[PDB]
Symmetry: C4
Subunit: 254 residues, 4 copies
């Protein structure tokens, strides 16, 4: 039932944000030792678990860019596109709230200790706990290209890993492999834009940080062009290219 | 036979405490370099091995919260609930003793070198080798919510990973995936309460540290409200919610 | 179709260079925390994904040394040897360009900040982002022996992991295991020559760095004997030994 | 054929020493960043590959303690016990020589730079590249207990992971899981005695270091009681206990 699938998409998306935002909070306000690889593998494995939990019900999109691409290139029912997307964004938002609630005290003590004013340009770093912001050395267009390229890779490899007509079927290994895929993308490209690749994963938590005291910088990242636009459209404009490229360059040759 | 299952639960629970408490001892008194992720993945993989060793005999609960939840939502024989729980706690206690016995000299030389009085409030850090204690910035109720939420997630995902009617069956991959699940929980939430999620895993070693010279602080953690209560009830009150949530939100939609 | 296989070899080789060169760029110009193991596992998993993507089409050589060895010991069609090799080198070259394009600004700001003249002997370190260079303490012949030994091991274990007549078939696990194989080679021998083991993986990006401003040092590494020769021939002269050794010492005993 | 099995045991044992001793050399003389977990996982995965390579031919013992235990509790042909053990020790010795040959220059430059006299008590640290030595805070008997306990665990879990009558068969996952088992043992107990658990893995390289200039300390570790005895007998006296415990406590209940 659609209602059951929307619930799964809500829970699955919330689950990966819980693990994801959770580990970044540990790094930022709990002093945990996490390198780029550790942060990336935790996000990836977190995603794998979310897939294992919801694949049997909704098919585990847990990503608006993936839903839209599967609609355009996988015959996914267009009537379920918006219901899935609203569920994904709602789950991400709620999970972000839950993580903030559990780490609550550490956020305030860190801001107090380091004299950080939440909502200021300097608080964007802590806001990074919830969503993505661009590397200091790159601009809007450059950040957009990054998200576009990595999401295309994400979509393309998701199709390849789940395409049973491509080599030996992965079976139950598929979700795990998708998690490791996210891990290598995060390790190789993460320093540039925080490998968002998912509109729900970014906007939901951004809206929460906005409500929790970070204000407008949660959306702009302290940049002239409001940054939230990149994690919103770059992934969509990227998953479509990825899906297209797979069928034309790999599938059409299987 | 029940006697055979209690032996397996004793060994399995002891095995994961051996690996778990062992790596934390290495970190604390042997100067090993371990970040939050490393500590978490070792605990998780340690649990996976314990499952591989005992699943075929007892079903590998190795956790009182899991036993009680499987009794309430999986038709697990109620007559085996207490026998399993006593075996789990006894195994955890013994393994803790074994690890202390192997690292014995390093404990005393570390305390001597750093002028630490075992049993004092400052020795709670070393006591952390055996069991869990709350992050300095959070209190009793906050720590209780953490354990409740993560154990619910643990139970829920354990059911999802072992539910063959949910997507493609994991088969022999299940235990490993459960280990990785524990790893991501430990990495994302571990800095808050040491992701106990298991009454036997915490109480058994706490009782040992109590007997080995840490005294009352082993139970209180140096807090007004005796901390041991959290790792004792939070997990139980959490595994039940998790089990419930799975059947109602995911299973009922498969 | 051969055209379809050359496209897959181009994409697959480009994919592993993207992830590989990407993570090294993060380490060198983005300040990411990556140890030898992290760098090695990312390269390995990156290779695994490239295999999953192309195995079903071309068989996933993604390495000139592997193509030549499979031709000499696996009846691989000799008419496809050169088409595969040109595709592999072209894909590696293009991916290197793409990674440089995404990290563009970080390269210049790093060189500016650390007063590094691109093209100078001191810029060889940054050039290391794209390809391999020898450890300061070893010379040409020593570096050649390293690449020869590790590629022989690579080829031999690739055959063993994919040989269904050897123990229990790995099935869909094969690519992942090959990735982990590369990871352990990189961790144990990587500090010596950057575990190139693949002519396309090294020459393509070297030619790019040459064109992007590093000049002649991209090829020589600042050594009397032009270093590029080692990653070019050592792997070939090594994959053949490895393939030979497998059939004679292991296969002939199955 | 026995000759073919002895060759596989020689190669397999040599392979894991190559990866193992290789990564420790990187850490000690090549300045690579490796924590206890990284070193442990590399050794483990290295062992997994050695198993994948030789399991189909010899059954992949690659360890005298395992051969002897399988003879006493698995009906392994006693006529092949000594031939296997000589092959294991010879392979370990040769691999150690090969690793030293590839890292040759780094050893001398490190000793020169840090004014270390090879053969002196202070050179035992570098000798640690090849084999195991006890933690400064523990003595002979304590080190013996460690090796005994961990090898018993090793043997017992190897039997459990390969016992198809125990839960869902692992199939091709078995070797990998055994590698991860070694990884968690190394992470939790490695700081105490270098988790030798294998007479061939320790004696062979010790004999090499002895011949390569470390002299008598290679065998004694600079201790009154010659240390080499522990990695020699502790594992044997431990694998037997482990094998026994498995059949009596787990197998007899399947
Ligand atoms: C299983 C799903 C449970 C969802 C619980 C959501 C709990 C939200 O948590 C709450 O969020 C508030 C706003 O950020 C904070 O101010 C509170 O301190 C916090 O407890
Ligand atoms: C599940 C629904 C959660 C809704 C968002 C609640 C966020 C509460 O968060 C609070 O917001 C206040 C106003 O910004 C801030 O001043 C506080 O510091 C912050 O704790
Ligand atoms: C699913 C995502 C839909 C996003 C629709 C656009 C939401 C824009 O949101 C708006 O962004 C501005 C940024 O400066 C702010 O000034 C506004 O307060 C904020 O509400
Ligand atoms: C296979 C299971 C073996 C269980 C052996 C338990 C060994 C306990 O070990 C002992 O514990 C004592 C109390 O902590 C210490 O004082 C001793 O030094 C130590 O050797
Ligand atoms: C397997 C059964 C083990 C029972 C617990 C034995 C713990 C012994 O441990 C010892 O306890 C003494 C009293 O606290 C302390 O003074 C010592 O420092 C400590 O080594
Ligand atoms: C399976 C777990 C059952 C636990 C039952 C409660 C055990 C309480 O244990 C008690 O805790 C107090 C804490 O300050 C101490 O003062 C006591 O000495 C100690 O025995
Ligand atoms: C899906 C495959 C897309 C291939 C795109 C290749 C893009 C190359 O990228 C370009 O490379 C130039 C030379 O290094 C740089 O100067 C540019 O700044 C960069 O954008
Ligand atoms: C996909 C085809 C890419 C072809 C290579 C383009 C490399 C452009 O790279 C540019 O090269 C210039 C000349 O070396 C340098 O001076 C610049 O600093 C560099 O950005
Ligand atoms: C598939 C790989 C084929 C490689 C063929 C040899 C290419 C050599 O390339 C040459 O190397 C010299 C190094 O100093 C340079 O001086 C030249 O400018 C460069 O073009
Ligand atoms: C595939 C198996 C190849 C085995 C090759 C063994 C090579 C030994 O290597 C040699 O060892 C000597 C003694 O340590 C050193 O002095 C030499 O420098 C080194 O090259
Ligand atoms: C494969 C057979 C290898 C046999 C062992 C050769 C070890 C050579 O190693 C050499 O040994 C000399 C004597 O100790 C030392 O003085 C040198 O420093 C050392 O390089
Ligand atoms: C398979 C392993 C068999 C080992 C048999 C015992 C080998 C002992 O070896 C001996 O050890 C002594 C240690 O101080 C040295 O003095 C000798 O030079 C050395 O040859």
């Amino acid at each position: 039932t659609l209602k059951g699938q929307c619930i799964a998409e809500f829970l699955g998306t919330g689950l990966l944000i819980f693990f994801g935002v959770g580990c970044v909070a540990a790094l930022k306000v709990a002093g945990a030792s996490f390198g780029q690889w550790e942060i990336s593998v935790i996000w990836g494995l977190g995603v794998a678990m979310a897939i294992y939990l919801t694949a049997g019900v909704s098919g585990a999109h847990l990503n608006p860019a993936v839903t839209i691409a599967l609609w355009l290139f996988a015959c996914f029912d267009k009537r379920k596109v918006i219901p899935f997307i609203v569920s994904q964004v709602a789950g991400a938002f709620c999970a972000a709230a839950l993580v903030y609630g559990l780490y609550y005290n550490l956020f305030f003590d860190f801001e107090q200790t380091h004299h950080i004013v939440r909502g200021s340009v300097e608080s964007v770093d802590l806001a990074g706990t919830f969503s993505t912001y661009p590397n200091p050395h790159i601009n809007f267009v450059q950040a957009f290209a990054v998200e576009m390229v990595i999401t295309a890779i994400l979509m393309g490899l998701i199709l390849a890993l789940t395409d049973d007509g491509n080599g030996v079927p992965r079976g139950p290994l598929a979700p795990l492999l998708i998690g490791l895929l996210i891990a290598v993308i995060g390790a190789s490209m993460g320093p540039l834009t925080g490998f968002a690749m998912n509109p729900a994963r970014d906007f939901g938590p951004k809206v929460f940080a906005w409500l929790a005291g970070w204000g407008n910088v949660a959306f702009t990242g302290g940049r002239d062009i409001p940054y939230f636009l990149v994690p919103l459209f770059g992934p969509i404009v990227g998953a479509i290219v990825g899906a297209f490229a797979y069928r034309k360059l790999i599938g059409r040759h299987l």
